[PDB]
Amino acid sequence: EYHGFDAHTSENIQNLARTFTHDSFKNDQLNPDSENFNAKFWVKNLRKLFESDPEYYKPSKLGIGYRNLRAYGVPTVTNALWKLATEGFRHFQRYFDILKSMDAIMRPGELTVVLGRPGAGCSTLLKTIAVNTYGFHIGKESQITYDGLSPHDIERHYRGDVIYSAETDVHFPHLSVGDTLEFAARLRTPQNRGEGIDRETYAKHMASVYMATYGLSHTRNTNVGNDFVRGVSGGERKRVSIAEASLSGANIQCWDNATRGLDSATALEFIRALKTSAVILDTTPLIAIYQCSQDAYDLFDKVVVLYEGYQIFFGKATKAKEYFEKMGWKCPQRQTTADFLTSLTNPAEREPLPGYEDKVPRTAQEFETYWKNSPEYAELTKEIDEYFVECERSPASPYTVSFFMQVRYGVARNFLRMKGDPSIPIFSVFGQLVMGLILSSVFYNLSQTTGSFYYRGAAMFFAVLFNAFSSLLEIMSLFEARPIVEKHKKYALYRPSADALASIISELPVKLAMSMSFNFVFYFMVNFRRNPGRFFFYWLMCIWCTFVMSHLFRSIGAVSTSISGAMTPATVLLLAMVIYTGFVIPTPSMLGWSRWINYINPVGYVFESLMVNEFHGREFQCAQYVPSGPGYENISRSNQVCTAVGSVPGNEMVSGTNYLAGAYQYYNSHKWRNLGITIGFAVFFLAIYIALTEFNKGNREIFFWRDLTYQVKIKKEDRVILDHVDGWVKPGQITALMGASGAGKTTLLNCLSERVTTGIITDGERLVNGHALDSSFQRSIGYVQQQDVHLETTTVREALQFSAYLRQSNKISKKEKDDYVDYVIDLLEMTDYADALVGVAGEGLNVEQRKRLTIGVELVAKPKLLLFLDEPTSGLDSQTAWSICKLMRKLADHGQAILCTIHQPSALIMAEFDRLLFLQKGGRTAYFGELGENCQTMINYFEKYGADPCPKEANPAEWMLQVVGAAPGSHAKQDYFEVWRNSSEYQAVREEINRMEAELSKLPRDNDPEALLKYAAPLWKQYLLVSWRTIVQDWRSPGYIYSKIFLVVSAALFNGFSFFKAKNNMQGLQNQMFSVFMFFIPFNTLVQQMLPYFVKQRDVYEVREAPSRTFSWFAFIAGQITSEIPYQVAVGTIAFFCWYYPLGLYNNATPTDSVNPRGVLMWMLVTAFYVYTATMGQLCMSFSELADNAANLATLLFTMCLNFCGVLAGPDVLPGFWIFMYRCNPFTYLVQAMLSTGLANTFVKCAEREYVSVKPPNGESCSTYLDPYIKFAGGYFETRNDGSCAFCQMSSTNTFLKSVNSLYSERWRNFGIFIAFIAINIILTVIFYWLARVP
Ligand SMILES: CCCCC/C=C/C/C=C/C/C=C/C/C=C/CCCC(=O)OC[C@H](COP(=O)(O)O[C@H]1[C@H](O)[C@H](O)[C@H](OP(=O)(O)O)[C@@H](OP(=O)(O)O)[C@@H]1O)OC(=O)CCCCCCCCCCCCCCCCC
Ligand SMILES: OC(Cn1cncn1)(Cn1cncn1)c1ccc(F)cc1F
Known part of the structure; x- marks a missing residue:
């Protein structure tokens, strides 16, 4: 595991330094070979020395001092139009304060913690410190300095030295940790004068050293991964983020809830990594945390406490408790100091000391006044003023490497990313090949006569289209890599324009492969001109068309956020361009209002050039002379005429030039001009895309079980997950279910409620009043999952009503269901937001409200037996967990039987449960029974069977976990399963279970036929x-x-x-x-x-809703x-x-x-x-x-x-x-x-250009010569006053x-x-x- 730069880490760094200095080989503190060499000094010296020092001022460390800081800030589909109009009117033409006056100073090498309840302004404070004030403003009276610099200096010139990152670790899932850190090391390495040391090897050594420092050496050559893509563990991704941020040259680093959703064992490692970076690399880490353990709190150097935006204390983390106790507050026993400070803002908590109940601040203003009046505030103000005086007494581009170097590194990284996930290029190329083959199959071997005139027109129309949209999917790569690009811009690594250029360059091989694979097959399967020059011109035109279309798609996507969001407005434009390419509506047929569209259509010129290339200067054998048939067997060819637009009377062949001029109005003088126009369009769209990328960014029944044994099949070997577990629940009692990671508490919870999709039960049996489980059991229990899965549009009342209607018996009238829904809403205290939309997590109900809704959805179904809860308190701050515990206690008081799985609870939270079921590794129960007051009875158990006495101020959960050796680094004297099996307490449990089974069976049953139904409501309902x-x-x-x-x-x-x-x-x-x-x-x-x-x-x-059988x-x-x-x-x-x-x-x-x-x-x-x-x-x-x-x-x-x-x-x-x-x-x-x-x-009615001239034989008229043919085939004719007949083939x-x-x-x-x-x-x-x- 990670223990924060121990001796062996220094040994590893020494070996790495030895290797590095030997590689470049071909004082005492800096010689790896010499004795008395410290890795800390070597790591510190690496950043500054062993590289050229620019004359520009670049700070190697930063600290922030500020005084008087203050920050303030100001539907169905029918009403959407009204809302949009109101928003626009507001855009055309009071003050809500967030952070009040504050004073503080943070020096390099000190880890700082911002404590406070949610909504207290910790996130706003950390955003302000990191010069991330977007969304609000700071007062003009505030004096803020960064070691003598200014907020705007940091914002513009020295960006990247101060970084802010809160909850999302935006990394490339398929890029290895080594590559991810090497990229940052390369980009942050100055070039200047590289003489004396190779930049690549120096960057490699720096990346390896930083990997060693943060305990990531074993994660090399492993994909970083994501929530979807499997890779390094969640606790290692945070350390990777820290390593990347520190490797890019960040001195001040602000985090908000970066440890949210992490177990204590991993949050402690996160804090340890932050402390290591602070002490070794002289960084300034600030962290805003809501669930802090005592061990983690022992690492913090300074703490700032926020109460509704008021700073009520700033100073050493070891003096806050004494300061607040002198204020007149009593810290409850077994309470961590972080929780004590946080609860000192909660009226429900925060019990005053005896004798101080009359003189203690009660509102935020009183707390702030006390803090200001205290001598600590005076000393802090004096120190900050001295720091300001000292700072006062004593680079246009924040990026380090040149634009060309940024583009080169972006191209290399994109090639590496493609190598890591080569599925997309291969799939695209194979799809292009297969679909081009299929498309050429229908147009196979076009004939050389005029019968192909239509098909040759269609093929060339569908070739260009195939080249136009071949690069449509590359837009996806823009959306996946956007957050990482924004982060690296905020790190001052490279510009978005450089990344755009690198992305354009990187896929050129893919574009070439697709173009070859499609065009080479299509141009030859479909018989076009066989001249090599004609084929090469066609290929060049297709290449330029695909470049134009790719740049246009990139420009469209640069200002979008989703594929469908971009496609909805862009579909109209693409359809317009496809229609006005020049084939669907030829120029002669185009209307006056739309002839201008063809002028600005980049694809019309491509189509014209291709058609000119194919048709110009070509003779096609006539396939159908208009006068022919049974009545015309032997006539001279002078009288006949071909059935084509450019046909000439008496001619046996039709020229391509005439057909092009007549049907499409294309001419050969535009063959090469269109190429220039398309090149200009490509350049214009590329410029627009780069500009947009740069700028546009930013219960009477009782249920128990006996000898429950459960095994699963792993690697074709049976494994016992649950080993002879037993227990019970009773109405009005809460039974916590806890254990180590491998104790299988979740497995026991799922097996009890029949939610396991595998495994078998071997020895045990689950009973209700001594009766086995029938088909009605699944509908007689409630199950509250850890995650809150609700629709984002339904209201709270509607969400409850749906479940009430679909999960209650049919005999109950709708009014009764509504009454019970109202009763549950009142019980859970949701009247304030009963009609509020659930919405998304960011905008809508918060975590506590969502959890209350999740509980209510199960409550309204009226469970009759039990209420399983899967980790109700996990993933919540201390106050919300306390509220949920109080809600559960209230539910139990009302007669509900609750069995909840609990993970890493606090002493106060654990003290609220009635019974405990503790599971060892392998599903073996170590203790089952009441835990008494303040978990005393449980403590009285282990202590009486040979366990070390529990510390008077230690959390009972952690102590009992480490007694059985579950906690890392803990040694168990003996296995407590065997102790529990024969302890005179297991005998009591067995006797109670036997008595319950023997006695409760005599009670009369309540056999309801509707209970034995899979679903309550009929299928139609x-x-x-x-x-x-x-x-x-x-x-x-x-x-x-x-x-x-x-x-x-x-x-x-x-x-x-x-x-x-x-x-x-x-x-x-x-x-x-x-x-x-x-x-x-x-x-x-x-x-x-x-x-x-x-x-x-x-x-x-x-x-x-599936397992619940809704x-x-x-x-x-x-x-x-x-x-x-x-x-x-x-x-x-x-x-x-x-x-x-x-x-x-x-x-x-x-x-x-x-x-x-x-x-x-x-x-x-x-x-x-x-x-x-x-x-x-x-x-x-x-x-x-x-x-x-x-x-x-x-x-x-x-x-x-x-x-x-x-x-x-x-x-x-x-x-x-x-x-x-x-x-x-x-x-x-x-x-x-x-x-x-x-x-x-x-x-x-034929158009003037479609009439074909027929010369009747000498001494004959149009009618007498063409009527038999008209009888044969339709059509009509007109006399042109010249002797010839203008014939139209269709009537x-x-x-x-x-x-x-x-x-x-x-x-x-x-x-x-x-x-x-x-x-x-x-x-x-x-x-x-x-x-x-x-x-
Ligand atoms: C990072 C970006 C990457 C992008 C990819 C890069 C691409 C860069 C490529 C640069 C290459 C540029 C070459 C330009 C030179 C053109 C010289 C001909 C100029 C000319 O003008 O040749 C007209 C006759 C057809 O002309 P035509 O039949 O339509 O009518 C005329 C007749 O040719 C005749 O010759 C009389 O004119 P001239 O005497 O020549 O003045 C008159 O005859 P009529 O009117 O009486 O019929 C007419 O004008 O070309 C023919 O046959 C075929 C001749 C080859 C057609 C183009 C060449 C193929 C492109 C090169 C490679 C393709 C792509 C490269 C690889 C792709 C990816 C790696
Ligand atoms: O991509 C097509 C052209 N095509 C490719 N192989 C065969 N025909 C097909 N298509 C895609 N979605 C629907 N049809 C297309 C693209 C755009 C367009 F406007 C028409 C059009 F046919």
């Missing part, structure tokens, strides 16, 4: 309640429904008004088909938005499925109204007088599409754990469905292999139904609809098929969730 709760939670979510509405409305309006009043020419029909195709894009964003709110509900249900899994999954339907239906209605009418599709129904039926069918189709989106998202999420994986799988399946939906290529051109994917596609039928409903049964939209395999007579059937698919999804969900999650 559970389903209805769960669905309504989910609907309300979605409605009250802050910005979810509005996000969906905004995304859908914007996308639908843009799509509708891009094709506003679309004309029915030959190109207009294709444009409208691709409009329908693009109507489905918001699928991915909707799924991503919706999944997290399913994650939250699933977590809440499975963690707590409702069945079916009522959960069906409720989740039903919750989303109404919102999707409303969204689909809005989208249909925003898209159908702007396109003017109703005009296609006027000729046949079928406006209403077709409109109704289209509305149903759109709403069904949205419902299908929701069902598919839920299906893909059912069997997966993480939401990101479910979203990715849904996107992949949607892409596969869209590829083979019949738009890009019909079944005739699709390879026979993929035909099944064309039939099993839910989207083929949807697209066919939509197209047939919106386009069928109307006329077609009715039915021809195009048949070309796309869409029929107007099969719309309804198609619709039905789509509905079937929706049904399937739902069914699959209800099955998959059972297979993957239900146990």
Whole structure:
């Protein structure tokens, strides 16, 4: 373990120094070989000497002195708009004091502790000391100095010497401790003149020395880890944070609750590390702690006590107790001094001494007045004034290395991070390769005739898209590494711009690999121009396109906070760019209001360049001459003409240049200009991204058990976890259950309540009044978990009412349930915040309120037998733990039987329990019985069986733990299990259990048939309640429904008004088909938005509501499925109204007088599409754990469905292999139904550019020459007054609809098929969730 720089640590440092000085080999106190060499002096000298000393003033230590310091500071979805308007009006155009006058001085090498109750201003004080005043202001009368410097000097020039870090250890999970510390050592090492010593080896030696100092040498080559990623222990992560902070050159270090959620054995090591840093490296550590042990308190040098923002004492930690006792306060026996000082601000505690009850401060003002009047304050003020006088009498860039060095080190660290977790690049490259192969399969081997003119247009449109979004997932790397970048900026290590540049540079190999793997396959599987130069130009254009898109995505993400948050507004922009690339709406078809968008579209130029490269200067063999068929068997080719935009009469080949000029209006003079435009766009977006990164940042029945033995299978070997345990509980008694780490107290608690998912019971038996456990036991107990798992939107009253309704017997009327909920609220003292939203931990109920709500949720269910509590007091400050203990005592007084597991309690807390069950290592009970007054009886047990007498001022818990040798460094005289087995107290317990079993059995039973039911409420009631709760939670979510509405409305309006009043020419029909195709894009964003709110509900249900048997899994999954339907239906209605009418599709129904039926069918189709989106998202999420994986799988399946939906290529051109994917596609039928409903049964009028000139034979007219063909195939013609006929190949939209395999007579059937698919999804969900999650 860590014992704070013992002799062997000095030996290790001496060996390291010997190795370092021998490596560079190729006074007495600094020679590792010479005797009388002290590691402390070597470590101190390493930082200053053995490196060049810049002429700039750089302090090696800091201390802060200040006087007169004062700091002060100033919903559903319907009302969200009103709240936003009010907030904006407030933005357009009293004082609540936090910290009152304070005076203090902290010198280097002294560890300081800020004591006080929560909300007393300790965190604010430590923020002020660390020049972190953001969010409030300090008074102008306050005199603050840092060894003669100024707060603004520290803020701007000397940033990084003073650091603040409170509760979150932000590290890279997959980076080893050695690498993490080497990075800081390298970045903090000055360069200047490196002659005489290598910088790399010096940094390595410094990192190794600091690892040795903080006892982290054994953690080298081990991943730092995280709460999710496994790595070093939680107590080692804190020491890693300390080592990194001290290695970067921080002198003043402020921590708030950095030890929160740590056991005493590890909090003590944290304080020991802080003390070691203070004494060896002359740092100034300040810590704000709420649960401090006596051993930890013995390490503090100075203490500052805060009472509602008033500093009531500052001085040596060994004199606070005497000062406050002289004030007239009595310290209760067996109370740690830290707890005494903290409780001296609690009216419930803080009992005055006898005779001092009349003259003692009672309010914060009186305490402050006493402190000011005391001689200690006078001495402190004199010392601070002298320090100020001494300081008065006697670097633009806080960073150390140059920008190039910062970029280089960032690139190296990013490469190391990729090496540690190489899953993402490999997955991205393989996905790109596979999806490019699949996409090229449909476009395989495009022919050389004009029949490919469309497909060659589509392929090049989908190549660019594939290159555009290939780097979309890299944005994730921005969000993961953001907190670490902010921390290292606050440490004055490197700038955010340097990290951005390093991130851009590091993924260039990945970008190149993806580009090669996709383009090389695609350009050749899809038959494009085979010229090597053409391929290389295409590759260059794709490379520049992907650079532009990557920079744009990075710019968008630099000002975001979440993937869905960035995708909601960015989806509209990306859809607009995709639409105006130049293929969906060719330039001739673009409207006047939107022709400007194409000018500022970075992808339109790429598409134009690629199309020019492929088509210009190319001749395509004609595939279909318009006059042909049975009536035209032998005619001259002079009369015929090709069916293409640029076709020339009498020509057997069509030139690519004419087709490009006519259809798209692309020209070869723009082939290279577009490259320059794209390069300029890339540079502009890169500059914007860097600028944003730099700037935009910042109970009659009795339950007992006998001989309970419990074993589990570990490494294919049986292990005994519980060894013949026995005991009981009785109404009105609290039975603490304690033991060592390996005592298995938690295992005993879980096994008693039947919450263990493994193991078997061998010898024991659990009884209720002597009767075995029936099926009604699980519903006759309450269980309060350590963690508080509640929905963030439900109110306290609603949270209690849900449980009361779903867990109480049905015969009880709703009024009785509400009355009991009110009674429980009154009992637990929640009337003040009965209607308050639970909210998140940071904003909402505090820890005590959340724990009270957790207890109440179980109480309202009316447990009849027992109330298990899993560590109720753990993870709470002394006062909140005291309050919870008093609440438990009150509950016991009311007739409840309580059995609680207790971990590391204080003497006062332990004195409140009625009975104790103490477990040794291996589940062996050492003591079971009443602990008497002040734990006296328990003390009277061990002392009477050969144990050292308990100290008069020691905590009984710690003493009894160390008597049995459980505590580290403690020696047990003998195993106390055998002592307990034959002690005349085990005999009493056995006799009592036997008497209870023999006697209580005679009592008449209370056999209630409803008790023997798995769930209290019927299935339909559970389903209805769960669905309504989910609907309300979605409605009250802050910005979810509005996000969906905004995304859908914007996308639908843009799509509708891009094709506003679309004309029915030959190109207009294709444009409208691709409009329908693009109507489905918001699928991915909707799924991503919706999944997290399913994650939250699933977590809440499975963690707590599943074992409690509140409702069945079916009522959960069906409720989740039903919750989303109404919102999707409303969204689909809005989208249909925003898209159908702007396109003017109703005009296609006027000729046949079928406006209403077709409109109704289209509305149903759109709403069904949205419902299908929701069902598919839920299906893909059912069997997966993480939401990101479910979203990715849904996107992949949607892409596969869209590829083979019949738009890009019909079944005739699709390879026979993929035909099944064309039939099993839910989207083929949807697209066919939509197209047939919106386009069928109307006329077609060709545009001027689409008419093909036909020269009739000499001595013939247009009609007499073209009528037989018109009878064969549709179309019409016009006379151009020149002798030629302008022919249009299509006269009715039915021809195009048949070309796309869409029929107007099969719309309804198609619709039905789509509905079937929706049904399937739902069914699959209800099955998959059972297979993957239900146990
Ligand atoms: C960290 C960032 C990393 C980014 C990656 C870095 C990338 C840097 C690359 C720098 C390389 C720059 C090369 C520029 C030199 C162009 C010289 C041709 C200029 C020209 O102009 O060549 C026109 C004809 C086609 O022209 P065309 O068929 O469309 O029409 C004309 C005819 O070519 C004809 O020649 C007559 O014109 P000229 O006599 O030439 O003036 C007239 O004929 P007609 O009008 O009567 O038909 C017409 O103008 O190019 C052709 O064939 C094919 C010729 C190769 C096309 C580009 C070269 C390939 C790129 C290099 C490598 C690709 C990426 C590199 C690796 C990627 C990742 C590692
Ligand atoms: O990524 C695609 C293009 N694509 C890639 N392989 C096959 N088609 C598919 N896609 C992704 N989500 C939905 N469809 C795309 C990207 C953006 C876009 F606007 C359309 C579009 F088809």
